[PDB]
Design a binder for this molecule. Sequence first.
Ligand code: HEM
Ligand code: HEM
Ligand code: HEM
Ligand code: HEM
Lengths: 106, 106, 106, 106
Amino acid sequence: ADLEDNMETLNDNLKVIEKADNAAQVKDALTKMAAAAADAWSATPPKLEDKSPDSPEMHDFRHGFWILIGQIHDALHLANEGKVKEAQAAAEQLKCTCNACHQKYR
Amino acid sequence: ADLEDNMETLNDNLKVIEKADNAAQVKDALTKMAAAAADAWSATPPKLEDKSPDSPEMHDFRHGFWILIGQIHDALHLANEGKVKEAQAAAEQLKCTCNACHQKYR
Amino acid sequence: ADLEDNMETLNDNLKVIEKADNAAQVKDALTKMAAAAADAWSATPPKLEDKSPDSPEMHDFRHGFWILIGQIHDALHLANEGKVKEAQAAAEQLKCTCNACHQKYR
Amino acid sequence: ADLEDNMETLNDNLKVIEKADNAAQVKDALTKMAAAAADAWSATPPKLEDKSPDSPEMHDFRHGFWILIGQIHDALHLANEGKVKEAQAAAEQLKCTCNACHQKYR
Ligand code: HEM
Ligand code: HEM
Ligand code: HEM
Ligand code: HEM
């Protein structure tokens, strides 16, 4: 999938999580977010297309995805233990990772 | 100090940073923020007064200040290096941390 | 307490954790480790005594303690939920933070 | 690849890095490590074959490779900047991550 596609995926499932009222539905969305983040990890953003694939910018870019992934994985674990509220709380702070990368490269 | 008092010094100094011209000003502001963040770290917010001090909520609450502190110290480092534009971009970014805890617990 | 004192404290309770067979004893040691790490956070190490309190070295030094603290806090939470095994596993990885700082500044 | 096969490429390339003279060599070694780490990320180790794929153990197991990966990429960045001594100090440091997972799950 393209970056925009993964981003929309991240966005959609994020919304599902905020409303879900059962662990089953949160686990499903998080797994799906993990997949999208894993795929965007290697994408080259428009604003950085003119940079070295090994530039400080791209390294920081990929670093954001490595962070997000860790956070999604951490949240998925909480959901697996059936802690919907905690899982949901984790997703709120996770938004900050989304936002930090956007401020820099969107 | 009061949670309300600590929050006021955090909010006022963030503004000082967003308007700052030099490093002395940003450094002084971040320094006061660090102190307010450190003092707030052990507070119990109104909406969690009936929760166990060891609840996931309270653990997550304390985690938020732990994050904020790390973010202020890093911003402070950027400032100590005369990196104003960078320190300010850092202060702007940590706003999301403020927002995340407010959404869940304010 | 002096740095050496906190270090010995960190060391001792670390050993208690590895052997404890009940959550009560792990919670007690972790709380105590948290206290010692919090205190060493501000200490100036022998090898860095000739550096600027705001030098890259000291910033990285303090950063290690901020990491450790977060990890201890995370482990204490697991112990509070009564997950001795998980708590104990957390402490093993935590050792790496101890070791990373020592390699650099001990 | 096999967990044993991936572990052999991780161990052999670490040695190559410890003996390296230039960046080309370290970079090539770290690159192969990243690939082996990425492939191992989803393995189930012998001592956890009877555990649920969602157990805290397995979640912690996957977390270890998540850490390792972040450490190899950072080391790789140091290498891509011709920072050999630094890339090597980084490779030496991540050994503890290897050690931590072995202690718990090998
Ligand atoms: C879970 C967190 C995230 C959410 C909810 C999210 C959501 C979005 C959305 C809705 C868009 C709008 C454009 C579209 O998809 O049509 C977008 C764009 C973008 N995001 Fe994210 N995003 C997240 C995390 C990240 C991270 C961590 C990075 C960087 C490491 C990143 C980099 C970008 C970039 C570069 C764009 C612009 C893509 C383009 O040129 O069309 N995003 N994101
Ligand atoms: C740099 C970030 C922060 C800023 C600028 C900020 C700002 C504020 C402001 C303006 C208020 C309302 C007025 C006041 O109470 O003085 C407030 C309230 C509050 N903040 Fe923050 N805040 C920050 C971070 C945080 C963090 C990270 C947490 C939790 C971990 C938090 C928890 C709260 C709570 C619970 C209240 C309600 C307090 C009450 O009802 O008495 N804040 N904050
Ligand atoms: C929980 C993890 C840790 C444990 C178990 C631990 C244990 C120890 C021990 C046993 C010593 C031997 C000297 C003595 O205390 O008599 C020591 C020394 C030292 N550690 Fe740690 N330590 C830990 C974390 C850290 C961290 C994260 C840093 C840096 C951020 C650090 C910095 C130092 C330094 C500078 C010394 C030398 C102190 C001196 O000059 O005597 N330690 N540590
Ligand atoms: C850079 C770090 C690493 C190095 C150099 C390393 C090296 C090795 C070596 C030499 C072996 C024994 C020989 C072999 O199986 O080929 C091994 C086995 C093993 N390693 Fe690692 N390893 C690393 C990281 C990790 C990590 C982080 C984990 C877990 C998250 C892990 C889990 C295991 C397991 C379970 C075995 C036993 C496999 C079996 O019984 O088939 N290793 N490793």
